[PDB]
Amino acid sequence: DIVMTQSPSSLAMSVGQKVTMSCKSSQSLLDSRNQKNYLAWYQQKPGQSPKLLVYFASTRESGVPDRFIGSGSGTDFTLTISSVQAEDLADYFCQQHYSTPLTFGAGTKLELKRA
């Protein structure tokens, strides 16, 4: 099974700051054939179910603000939020959807500092 690891486990940032969080996997999620990485990012706000933010390693899903950018390839992926807003408070999970088991990383919990 492909193991997905995420870092950091949590981060606390004030509105307007940039955040970077990473997801590595222990096996490549890139095909040798179509050349695309089968990794998605989900956002789970408190009290809600996860919602798909990004798929392929980099396509942002419609509705998702362009402050979120997925990047990276092969075994090392990054989700960046260019300027974080209060509503981005959430746990962010990456996921292999290359092959079964689909598996997920353990999540980066984003917390919000404020006055």
Binding site: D1, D31, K36, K51, V54, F56, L102
Partner: protein
């Protein structure tokens, strides 16, 4: 409007079992595979298995082989998952979710059910 509806909760006795339901609507049910995910607070998300509704073909996470059975009813557009011999560690929220996979890359889940809170006690 694409929708996957589940019932809010299930209370079950340890050692017993349950059949979770997930009703689909808004799309051709047989056209997409159905996934089941488990979420325990603090632990995160865990994939249980999937099933193609058109022919009933299943694929399980080795960890849950023998604990979960997936079936579906193409007549009523419902997918099912039975969990057997439950124990306290099985308490959690269980989601049924749909996967698209076009583009040439990942089976990126695009639609999730409301989730069912199961409590073993």
């Amino acid at each position: 409007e694409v929708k996957l509806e589940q019932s809010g909760a299930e209370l079950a006795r340890p050692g017993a079992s349950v059949k979770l339901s997930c009703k689909a609507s808004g799309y051709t049910f047989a056209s997409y595979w159905m996934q089941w995910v488990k979420q325990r607070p603090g632990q995160g998300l865990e994939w249980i298995g999937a099933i193609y509704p058109g022919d009933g073909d299943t694929w399980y996470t080795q960890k849950f082989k023998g604990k979960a059975t997936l079936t579906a009813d193409k007549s009523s557009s419902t997918a099912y998952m039975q969990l057997s011999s439950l124990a306290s560690e099985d308490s959690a929220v269980y989601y049924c979710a749909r996967p698209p996979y076009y583009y040439g890359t990942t089976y990126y889940f695009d639609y999730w059910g409301q989730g069912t809170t199961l409590t073993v006690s």
